[PDB]
Structures are given as structure tokens and as C-alpha cells.
Amino acid sequence: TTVYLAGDSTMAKNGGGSGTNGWGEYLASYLSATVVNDAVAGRSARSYTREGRFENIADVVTAGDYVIVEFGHNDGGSLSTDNGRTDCSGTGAEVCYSVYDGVNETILTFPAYLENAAKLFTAKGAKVILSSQTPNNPWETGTFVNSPTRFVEYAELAAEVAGVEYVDHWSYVDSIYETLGNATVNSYFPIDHTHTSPAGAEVVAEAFLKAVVCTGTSLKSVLTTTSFEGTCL
Numbered sequence: 001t002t003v004y005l006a007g008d009s010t011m012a013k014n015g016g017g018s019g020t021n022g023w024g025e026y027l028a029s030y031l032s033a034t035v036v037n038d039a040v041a042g043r044s045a046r047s048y049t050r051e052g053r054f055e056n057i058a059d060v061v062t063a064g065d066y067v068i069v070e071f072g073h074n075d076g077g078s079l080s081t082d083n084g085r086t087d088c089s090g091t092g093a094e095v096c097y098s099v100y101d102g103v104n105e106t107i108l109t110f111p112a113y114l115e116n117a118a119k120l121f122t123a124k125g126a127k128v129i130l131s132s133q134t135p136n137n138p139w140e141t142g143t144f145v146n147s148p149t150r151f152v153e154y155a156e157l158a159a160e161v162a163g164v165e166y167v168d169h170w171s172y173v174d175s176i177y178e179t180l181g182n183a184t185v186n187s188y189f190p191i192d193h194t195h196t197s198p199a200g201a202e203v204v205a206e207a208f209l210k211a212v213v214c215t216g217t218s219l220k221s222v223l224t225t226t227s228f229e230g231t232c233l
């Protein structure tokens, strides 16, 4: 069994640079399955699709494998000053066009990209798990601020429409960060409010696994332990 990870710098090996790391790097210790971390810094659901990264996972994935998809951090912004990452606004079949990198590109909504990827993987027999993006430092101002992005609910909607599993990674990380306190969570963010240090990546990875056990996600079957702090929800 192989577990494929598709995500951004919050998940990728080497994180966002300068000593940060991604949470996908701390998953393998807890699974009896091979983990292939295909997350890449700077990618959104759009650019990951455009660069052929979802397609490449589709090529090697086999029946019984898992694919965990988690995007959102790089998905916002404005299409007027197109950075190649911003998705089209909307929750459904809406379509946008923008000239980026010498191509009049057809741009889909965030949910559309995730649904399309899930359909490719599911048709081959892989188990797909859409996961909401991790939160940016909620203690940044000294007090706890709980503010999810639209991509948190969008991921849930995508899982509903595609008929796959959903893991609310956002809530589980924000819940544990709230209990950790100001001084500790701030120490997890060395250079900005997004990229986690190795300790913060470990906490983020454990929170994903806490979400899996609490919700009963299929991945539970290759989980080596359920000993993680926090509570369900």
C-alpha cells in the first residue's frame, strides 16, 4: 500500500525554506504503508493541475492506494494580476480565462480541480481523502483568532460532490494550537505566519492523525498508533 501526498509548502519536504518543514515529512513514522510526498512549495489546486502533478500521481497509483490532497494556502488572490496560482471564483462549474505564461488558460474553481483529481484516482480504485488546509499562525497577534478561509469549506464541499472522504485538518490543528498557547505556537513559526519549524510540522501531522481516528477515515487501517493529544472535534 502506498500513500500519496499532494499539497504545498505546508506539507512538502523542506517546507518553505530556511529551516521550515512540511507535515507530510512526519507521517511515515505512524503508518505501516509507504509514503510518497509529492507536495511542492508554491502550488495551488490550479498550478498543481496545470503542471501535470495530479496526472503523474494518477499514472502510478494502483487499487488500494491512498491519495491525500490538501490545498488552499496559495489558492486565493486576484486574477487581474494573475500569479498563475489563483483559481476561478465559485464553488461549481464556473470557468475563467486568463493569459498566463503565454497561454490563454482555462481556469476552474478550487472545488472543480479537486473533484476532477478525485475522479481520476477513484476510477482506478484508489482511496481519496481531501483535507482542508492548515491554519496560518492563529496566535500571531498575541491572542487566539479563529478565522477559517473559504477553502476550508470548499474542500468539504468537494469531498461531498466527488463522493470521497474528507478530513477537517484545519479544525484539528486550530483546536490543538488553541490549547498549546501563545508562546509555544509562535515558536512554531520562525520566519512568517505560514511555514512551520520541524516541531510545528510534527504537531500538524499528529493533528491530521487525530482527525483520522476521531472521524473514522479509511486511513485508520494502516495507522500504527492512536496515542495523540487533544480531543475529538
Ligand SMILES: *[C@@H]1O[C@H](CO)[C@@H](O[C@@H]2O[C@H](CO)[C@@H](O[C@@H]3O[C@H](CO[C@H]4O[C@H](CO[C@H]5O[C@H](CO)[C@@H](O)[C@H](O)[C@@H]5O)[C@@H](O)[C@H](O[C@H]5O[C@H](CO)[C@@H](O)[C@H](O)[C@@H]5O)[C@@H]4O)[C@@H](O)[C@H](O)[C@@H]3O)[C@H](O)[C@H]2NC(C)=O)[C@H](O)[C@H]1NC(C)=O
Binding pocket: 141, 142, 143, 182, 183, 184, 186, 187
Ligand atoms: C506571545 O508570544 C510572543 C513570543 O513568545 C511574545 O513576544 C515576545 O515577548 C518577549 C518577552 O517580552 C520579547 O522578548 C524581549 O525582546 C526584546 C527585543 O525585542 C525586539 O527584538 C525582537 C528580535 O528582533 C530581531 O529578530 C526578529 C525575528 O527574527 C526580527 O523580526 C527582527 O527584525 C530582528 O532581527 C523582535 O522579535 C521584537 O518584536 C516584537 O516587538 C515589536 C514592538 O516592540 C513589534 O513590532 C513586533 O511585532 C514584535 O511584537 C522586538 O522588536 C529584548 O530586548 C528583551 O530583552 C526580551 O528578550 C520578544 O521580543 C517577543 N517576541 C515577539 C515576536 O513579539 C508575546 O509577548 C506573547 N503575546 C502576548 C500578547 O502576550
Ligand SMILES: *[C@@H]1O[C@H](CO)[C@@H](O)[C@H](O)[C@H]1NC(C)=O
Binding pocket: 097, 098, 099, 104
Ligand atoms: C480566451 O478564450 C475565451 C474563449 O475560450 C475567449 O472568450 C477569451 O476572449 C480568450 N481570451 C483572450 C485574451 O484571447
